[PDB]
Subunit: 257 residues, 4 copies
């Protein structure tokens, strides 16, 4: 089977992607923080229910060395490495005038620097194994339009968008492709947090902010990991071999770029 | 089963899309100009070889009435109608200052008005059958960045881009999605034509223009109908359900949007 | 004195642009439909009040020959021709499924073919006069994001967007630049018509659709011609000499591209 | 007289902007590294030659505390504060696979974090003075399309693009606007550096990389500070009052977005 690593695969969009890629015939390397291993258990169970090989790989994407060994371990255990999905990331909700250098340093490390490290490690591995790989990064609608109150987060996603473009161009001659998926409003822990932090600011009751930000989706429904998985499935398959440097929206109809 | 109509399916990108969707398990209605029914023989041959039902449908996409009946016929012959691919289209190569009103009327009818007609007929057929359909339009890199000497063509593709966004939002409540594919340099009959005409204009030898316009492709190789077929496969599949109003580039890396 | 022709200058944005460019030192050729001369009386008044020459020129931008004669007349009566603002245009409001071929031919003629003709005529005159000119087209937020119910209109603006790009690249070697302005919701006769047609569709009282569509403008206020004139002033000035092929948003904060 | 602070105004585009704004009627605060004071003496001369007041303010934009005191000092010395131009920035030239965390921390601090700091300090001063202000950020064509070998730098500019959008929406209620200028290839000390570094990488002789990258400019020639100052002049004037959250390209025709 082909091998793909999904960072942040312990839960949310990461888990959904892992389950889907497994159904597509990929053996999966579920990479996420070491403390998230128990949480990853379910993700692992889903991969194995799809009749594929799964292994958890402890990783803090903010650390290059850890990312390099994380990918070596994954390739070793699964006997290959063909796709890297840089899904791991965090969100920050805070008025622009309140953002601190501390906030910035932290979110750029987890959301941007990590992608540089994952791209570099994926590249080394691909070449080492003598194969053409696929790198898939998690952008967002916030990478296409900056969102108020989520300025720090938005800027890191824009950075990911720009990185996807530059990296795809530098790795293209080697035959590797780099694309990104941009989901809309996905009811995961990230939004329970966003909605919770928004509530503390505007006073709207819990869950209410989620509904308002969701009221604009053309298809009239908030998203679930499966929706995002569908696009990532394409980005990992052979059908996307001629697509590179793009950031594709899977937002049910929110932005049209 | 699932039924899809591919206009301009008698050759080039249209044929490849028909063959791809056939492999995906779609019964195909190859819609093209009556004059191309013979040229379309091979296409129907490629479809039946993938063990799917294929029927030719005489259609001049510029004629609304013909498009309405064309879809009625396809839905009656194949027993259903789930996907429409507005692929039929033409190219014009001419310096801006030389473009005539007749050039404009001609190209806008085939490249733009036709997509409106197709979108309307498809939407009505989806509703009659009680199906949530997928409409896929043929955009192009020229729909993202206007190209000199191909201004008329570029403008129609930009129109398709805008139409794709507008139609997606308008048809979302019925559950229908509208997306587009934007290929780069695809070595089909259309580019033989483009290279030939550009040759007469700038004087460069035959084939040289084709190479010239291809020297920017990150992946380092021009495109074939198969490359585009890959994206359309995703757009016609269930994996793209939460994607709408988007114009996705399959250009090997030329524009990044 | 520097000379600028403003098509559709009898009222709305065209009138605002005329008055502004006059204030900037331009003599203005107010080009509009013959029956609009009386209406243009105010535009001309506003222009002459800035110690500048103003002349009404009968022009139906949908006719190539008339555009040529109009620019010739403007150049001869004002003694030069430095800037052409392709502002004339119309709006159509109608569900996508109701859009007829007649509607399409009409709106594309007025909003798109007209711009080709305008660009061609302006380019000729510039060269004839041995000067480098500025062509400024009227785009719209609808050229950046298609709007439902105004699908035909949106597609024409996207076409204008593409035309601006293609033309800028094609005319650059001659030193001419082609840019466009993209206003948001401006209270003119065009929005009176849009609001009125929307009202017929959703039953909202007159003025409410305008208010609703304007409720999300970041700067918290609908637009007036003067706002747009601000950008066009830049685009007609020496300050924009190194800007070309761009579609610039002056929408108070609606779309960000 | 109105007051504007131009960071990195000791030379290059910053100097060009300071001179232009001075010419438009603004008193200028030239903010740059203390070591650049002597260098800035040239900028100060160009400003005073316009019969406008000028002062140098020692500022390392990466230091938030320093940025707050610099704006205080600026507003106090010039008796006002209406415009802030976040122009200070650096470039890095290095293959993606070689980018280090040290490079990233470095370039993001100077190119992105500083902008957050400037916006915050500007906003606070604007409100303190009870005025509506304009914030203008230095983006780049690299903020619109990521460039190979300039990945780190590109990603920072994309972040600035996102920041400009998010800040615009967040500060709009107060009446402040935030926009950005995106220069193309400007022959300043920065490109001297980029060319020199590119030279060591691809072996091309000195100066050839500058020409190579410039070859594609529609208007046929590289840019000078004044080309950029033209757009900034618009961005600092009342003509841009209804424009916000935009990143406008002044690249002579390289990217069209
Ligand atoms: N939820 C949404 O609506 C939405 C919209 C757009 C984009 N995204 C993006 O999709 C991705 C997944 O988001 P989600 O909703 O599933 O989030 P989530 O919080 O549910 O899951 C994120 C996972 O990332 C892991 N992680 C965090 N920091 C890490 C680090 N330093 N090293 C390794 N693993 C780390 C977490 O342990 C967690 O399992 C993110 O990049 C997010 O920005 C989400
Ligand atoms: N070839 C490329 O490099 C390229 C790049 C981008 C986009 N496209 C788009 O993809 C589509 C297919 O292009 P292609 O290369 O396969 O072209 P092609 O010339 O090989 O095929 C075009 C098909 O369109 C049919 N057709 C033309 N006018 C028609 C009409 N009025 N009614 C019905 N059928 C009609 C023709 O019979 C023909 O089979 C077009 O819309 C084109 O704009 C092509
Ligand atoms: N009103 C808005 O909110 C808005 C937003 C974006 C873009 N625009 C664009 O700005 C431009 C001006 O719009 P407006 O609000 O001032 O409209 P308007 O209806 O107030 O003015 C349009 C002018 O165009 C002239 N005109 C129409 N058809 C013509 C033809 N065939 N030949 C010559 N002149 C013709 C009319 O006589 C009229 O004076 C249009 O291109 C429009 O699409 C308007
Ligand atoms: N040169 C180009 O072609 C080009 C194209 C697009 C965008 N830009 C952008 O325009 C801006 C100006 O570039 P340039 O060509 O004038 O560069 P430059 O090197 O000529 O000038 C940059 C100035 O920034 C100052 N500076 C650097 N770090 C600083 C810090 N931490 N604190 C305070 N001041 C600091 C320097 O002292 C210097 O005077 C940058 O943001 C750059 O990214 C340049
Ligand atoms: Mg697929
Ligand atoms: Mg100006």
């Amino acid at each position: 089977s082909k091998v793909a690593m999904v960072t942040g695969g312990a839960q949310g969009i990461g888990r959904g992607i892992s389950e889907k890629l497994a159904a597509d015939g990929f053996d999966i390397a579920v990479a996420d923080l070491p403390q998230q291993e128990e949480q990853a258990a379910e993700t692992i169970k889903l991969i194995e229910a799809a009749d594929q090989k799964a292994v958890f790989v402890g990783l803090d994407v903010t650390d290059k060395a850890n990312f390099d060994s994380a990918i070596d371990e994954a390739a070793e255990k699964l006997g290959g490495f063909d796709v890297l999905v840089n899904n791991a990331g965090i969100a920050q909700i805070k008025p622009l005038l309140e953002v601190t250098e501390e906030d910035l340093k932290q979110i750029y490390s987890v959301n941007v620097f990590s992608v540089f490290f994952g791209i570099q490690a994926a590249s080394r591995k691909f070449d080492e194994l003598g194969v053409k790989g696929k790198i898939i990064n998690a952008a967002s609608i916030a990478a296409i339009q900056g969102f108020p109150i989520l300025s720090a987060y938005s800027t890191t996603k824009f950075a990911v968008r720009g990185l996807t473009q530059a990296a795809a161009q530098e790795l293209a001659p080697k035959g590797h492709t780099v694309n990104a998926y941009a989901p809309g409003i996905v009811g995961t822990g990230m939004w329970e947090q966003i909605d919770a932090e928004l509530s503390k600011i505007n006073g709207k009751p819990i869950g209410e902010n989620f509904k308002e930000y969701s009221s604009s989706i053309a298809l009239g429904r908030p998203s679930v990991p499966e929706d995002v998985a569908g696009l990532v499935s394409f980005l990992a398959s052979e059908n996307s071999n001629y697509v590179t440097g793009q950031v594709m929206l899977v937002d049910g109809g929110m932005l049209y770029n």
